[PDB]
Amino acid sequence: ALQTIINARLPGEEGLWQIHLQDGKISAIDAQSGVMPITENSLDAEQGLVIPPFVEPHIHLDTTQTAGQPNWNQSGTLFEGIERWAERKALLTHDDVKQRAWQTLKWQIANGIQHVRTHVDVSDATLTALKAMLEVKQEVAPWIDLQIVAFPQEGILSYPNGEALLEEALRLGADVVGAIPHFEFTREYGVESLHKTFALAQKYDRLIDVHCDEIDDEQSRFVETVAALAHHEGMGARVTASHTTAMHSYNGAYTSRLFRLLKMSGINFVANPLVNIHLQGRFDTYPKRRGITRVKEMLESGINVCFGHDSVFDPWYPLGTANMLQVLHMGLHVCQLMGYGQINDGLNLITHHSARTLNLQDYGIAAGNSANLIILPAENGFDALRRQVPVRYSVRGGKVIASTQPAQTTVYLEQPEAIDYKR
């Protein structure tokens, strides 16, 4: 078994490092003063970057791989997406869900993702997808720690037996309680649905992840209730507000007032760049707003924010290979986090910040932690992002679970020349 990772670069650190492994855990981390020789039982990072695993804080594995079935989302909006999904949800089968979820999970394993939070639509009396996903969770455990959010896609108060079905999903084992206040029939149902969500999370000791204000409506302010209830219950670390795209349209004075509460509450935020740039701004003609939440300001204020892929070939997104560096690339551009340091520090948005969002207790390159880490063939975060590098090796429990032999490009000039796009 592997005993050491050598010649590793670490974000924010100078030089090279050696990571000693023992019994599936990291036993010690020591700085090197030069390049170490390879040897049996040593995985050579070759001066590449070593980081804890990529994380997918927000994806829909029950809907993945279904775009165009039975119809396509023509308008490219959240609302038509839900209608198209409703048509597909009526055709679900146990095996159908497991096969599609596993297809995307394999792409995630290949992409160095070892932690995934999937929402599963529980606005369905049969709970077909949830039952299938609970089995997938057990099956994929050796490679990915999968969290399941009981997501009441059609509302808690606005769907028949919505609250009972949400609770049934928790009794069956869902890890996180979801909600979607802006989709409820009225603002009052939206606020009430959040009180019910928090009560269920406290009753069952579960996390919370709300699809919150995913709409270009400057009056959609459910995020303040999510943060206030979390603060009141002293449970911010266990709470996440996904999307908050309406915040892109708020006036600045209200946003400033709100930010004090967001920071005090300690709740987490997920932005989904690939899907948000596609679904938001659809009701504008020109100019057209970007529609991503206030990521730059959250980072400046010390509010935990991270990025999710959200959808992979489904009603809300026709593309994707479940690649977090690609999600990061889109977010940095749309949010204008284009300074050198902002880009270089971008990896935090798909690693550490996402681990905090999932309330992970065993994450990071530190002594005592499980030996879960990935190696990128790049010098730092900036380089990895610019070149959209693959994951050279993914290690879990001290064993290699995925590897990518890099592509080899040659140009035939006066003589052949290898091209690696580096400077």
Show the binding pattern over residues 120-159: x = contacts ligand FPY (CB under 6 A), - = does not: ----------------------------------------
For 411, 418, 422, the CA distances from 415, given in Å and listed in that order, are 8, 10, 19
Residue 153 labelled as part of a binding site: yes
Question: What is the closest distance, in whole angstroms, from the C-beta atom of residue 113 to ligand FPY in the complex?
Answer: 18
- Which of 310, 329, 347, 395 is close enough to bind ligand FPY by CB under 6 A? 310
Residue 211 labelled as part of a binding site: yes
The residue of the chain with the least Cβ separation from ligand FPY equals: 316
Residue 85 labelled as part of a binding site: no
Catalytic residue among 14, 214, 297, 379: 214
Tell me the C-alpha distance between 155 and 139, whole Å.
30
First to last CA, the chain: 36
Of 268, 288, 291, the C-alpha closest to 279 is 291
Interaction of residue 289 with a copy of itself, rule CB under 8 A? yes
Interaction of residue 423 with a copy of itself, rule CB under 8 A? yes
Confirm whether 214 is a catalytic residue: yes
Interaction of residue 60 with ligand FPY, rule CB under 6 A? yes
Of 176, 277, 262, the C-alpha closest to 222 is 262
Q: Rounded to an integer, what is the distance from CA 68 to the centroid of its chain?
A: 24
Show the binding pattern over residues 273-302: x = contacts ligand FPY (CB under 6 A), - = does not: --x---------------------------
Interaction of residue 117 with ligand FPY, rule CB under 6 A? no
Show the binding pattern over residues 313-342: x = contacts a copy of itself (CB under 8 A), - = does not: x----xxxx----x---x--xx-x-xxx--
Show the binding pattern over residues 166-205: x = contacts a copy of itself (CB under 8 A), - = does not: ----------------------------------------
Which tokens is 102 given? 């596993």
Instruction: Tell me the β-bridge partners of 31.
Output: 17
Of 402, 317, 405, 404, the C-alpha closest to 114 is 402
Q: Rounded to an integer, what is the distance from CA 44 to the centroid of its chain?
A: 28
Report whether 29 contacts 89 (CB < 8 A).
no
Which tokens is 315 given? 């009603």
The residue of the chain with the least Cβ separation from Fe ion equals: 310
Residue 195 labelled as part of a binding site: no
Q: Where are the alpha helices (DSSP H) in 111-186?
A: 128-140, 162-171
Beta carbon nearer to a copy of itself, 24 or 173: 24
Binding-site members for Zn(2+) are 58, 60, 211, 310
Give the active site residues.
Answer: 214
